Amino acid sequence: PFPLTSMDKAFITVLEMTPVLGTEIINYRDGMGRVLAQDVYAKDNLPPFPASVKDGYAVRAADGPGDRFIIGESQAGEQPTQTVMPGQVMRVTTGAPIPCGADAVVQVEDTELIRESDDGTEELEVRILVQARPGQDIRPIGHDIKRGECVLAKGTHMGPSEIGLLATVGVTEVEVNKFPVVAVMSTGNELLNPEDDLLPGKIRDSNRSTLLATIQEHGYPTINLGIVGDNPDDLLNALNEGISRADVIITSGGVSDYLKQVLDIDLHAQIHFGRVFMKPGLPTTFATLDIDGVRKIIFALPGNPVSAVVTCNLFVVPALRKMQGILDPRPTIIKARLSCDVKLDPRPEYHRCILTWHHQEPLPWAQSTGNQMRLMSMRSANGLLMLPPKTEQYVELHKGEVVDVMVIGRL
């Protein structure tokens, strides 16, 4: 007899009661998806030497437009040793360091060759046609990155670009938030393992395989607790191992006495809600357990396969993201058009769909595949349609009308 909890009350409750994990030191190569728990400062200047921007000649601006002797060429990886004297110039490339005595670089397009070398290619003398500006076409020391400058702020969710940035400044070790370890178990006497052949009155367990695969997609470590029989003893033993090995425990099915009893009386855990006004996902249950100053969270998902995966993306996924240090764990919601007419239900409805962009059409189309038992497309569902509850004015939606779609997969 648990009061009907609204979607908003349930969703906010999960986020508020979900704690943030501690910190650890990792290598920068494994920084993908991690959240910085420290500020990152550069210890060197970039570039460490004055470098040319264009292909041409490094010149002295004070000399002005005149005849110059080419004394040599600067190459990348080699610090120049020659000094540019008045009336002299040096061949330079886009990546080469600027030699001493030079204050400007003139590109080849503004020059004319006076003399070719009688043999073996090379350049001897050149005419400067343009009055060069002091510091023209030169990248000064520390132009891009200064010493002591903060290159990455605390709380930054690092991607491929951020990793390369770390490599540039020479920070190979960084402090990040820990990743949550999730344990998943299934309850039910009618459940068998996928590898087994069917027996009378038995079916194969599909929820466990799907739930684990979903969590793995977001990059979190998982633990398989296997199938647990529907009895008080086995639930206690299964949950005890889950708490000991993981921070998060997820169970599926068998809701409609033993599960909620052991959590309350035996485990002394705090059950927040047991029923939520939604379709599907009615018997969804969420509870927290505090042991040794550490908070463990437990998710009890419905037995229905569709109900399990829907509640997973709505409740479990945002919860997991908060623990790893993500500042905004709320999912991305976009606008799309309905592909088919739908009748509204008194409950808010959620069902998997496919987002497709057409030729120069500003809004994407959402194709309903949620009514399984089944549309066979070559593509997997990448969105979750979010239909509004039935009202006095709105009872039915028509094809083409704009609705909200929550992105749940890589587009």
Binding site: F11, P348, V402
Partner: peptide
């Protein structure tokens, strides 16, 4: 934001 979709004209 909100979990319920809702709509506009």
């Amino acid at each position: 934001f909100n979990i319920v979709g809702t709509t506009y004209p």
